[PDB]
Ligand binder design. Structure first.
Ligand SMILES: Cc1nc2c(ccn2Cc2ccc(F)c(F)c2)c(-c2ccc3c(c2C)CCCO3)c1[C@H](OC(C)(C)C)C(=O)O
Ligand SMILES: Cc1nc2c(ccn2Cc2ccc(F)c(F)c2)c(-c2ccc3c(c2C)CCCO3)c1[C@H](OC(C)(C)C)C(=O)O
Ligand SMILES: C[As](C)(=O)[O-]
Ligand SMILES: C[As](C)(=O)[O-]
Ligand SMILES: C[As](C)(=O)[O-]
Ligand SMILES: C[As](C)(=O)[O-]
Lengths: 139, 139
């Protein structure tokens, strides 16, 4: 897929919200545990994401997620416009379950699962693929 | 410099704490506004960082930052061992000052400054250099 496309969705676990961003072309994930599912939290997440990777386009399974003025302002400022994703989210949810008792806080288990997911060789890992896709696109 | 070396330090602004991670070889920055300067916050930041980039070694200007059991546990689990940095932190502090009135929250201004810093061409940007350094190291 195009190297600037990311998918963002929230999932719920233990009464908390996990914002999951998938780089569609590599399967690479960025995730954070947010206090609430709000436009301000999504906007802040998008600003962080766009400063770290070249974010061109964002996709989601819940269109209404992107209607706040806060989200529209983040996309405006950062210059963002509006199978794999289902699979990557499924893998992450499974990994969180597998490491959950190794940590007190869900947020810690989430970051351990992101780490495991991005480094797992499938033969390259999602972390290796994103860096290869973005470097070759710059070239 | 070696591609797995990162420098982590905290700086203070408006009574808040900004954790700044610099990828020494590229000048690329990752930053977060943390509620307090604690071992638990540093450990959590390191886990997130290590799941996104291949973190081999961490440097700091304040050695005591890395003594908590929480930090030692994050480095153990993620397999981490213990001019440019001064310049990158200086540039970020200047950029935050330059964009500060464009946002209500300091954390928003911080992420705008990270974005500006990583995308600025110096001729490649810090964001372009990190992806090139890591991709060629995998190759
Ligand atoms: C806190 C916050 N609110 C925002 C927005 C945007 C709309 N609103 C709603 C609103 C409503 C009434 C107002 F009087 C008012 F001033 C803003 C940004 C925001 C979001 C993204 C963003 C920018 C802004 C200002 C500036 C350029 C980079 O991208 C904010 C913002 O905070 C979050 C990122 C946490 C949402 C902020 O700190 O100002
Ligand atoms: C909350 C937290 N505390 C930690 C630690 C480690 C030591 N301590 C102190 C402590 C003291 C007394 C205990 F009875 C006790 F159980 C742990 C991790 C932590 C930090 C990093 C880390 C791991 C753990 C458990 C597991 C493998 C991946 O890396 C935590 C941890 O929370 C933060 C990351 C926010 C610090 C957690 O959720 O358990
Ligand atoms: C992306 As959900 C709020
Ligand atoms: C609002 As988004 C593109
Ligand atoms: C890195 As400072 C706490
Ligand atoms: C504790 As760190 C290397």
């Amino acid at each position: 897929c195009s190297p600037g496309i990311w998918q963002l969705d929230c999932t719920h676990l233990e009464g908390k919200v996990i914002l999951v961003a998938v780089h569609v072309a590599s399967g690479y994930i960025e995730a954070e545990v947010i206090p609430a599912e709000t436009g301000q939290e999504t906007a802040y997440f998008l600003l962080k994401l766009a400063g770290r990777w070249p974010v061109k386009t964002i996709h989601t399974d819940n269109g209404s997620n992107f209607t706040s003025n806060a989200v529209k302002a983040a996309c405006w400022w950062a210059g963002i416009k509006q199978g794999v994703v289902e699979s990557m989210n499924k893998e992450l949810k499974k990994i969180i379950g597998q490491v959950r008792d190794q940590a007190e806080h869900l947020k810690t288990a989430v970051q351990m699962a992101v780490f495991i997911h991005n480094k797992k060789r499938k033969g390259y890992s999602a972390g290796e693929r994103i860096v290869d896709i973005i470097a070759t696109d710059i070239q």
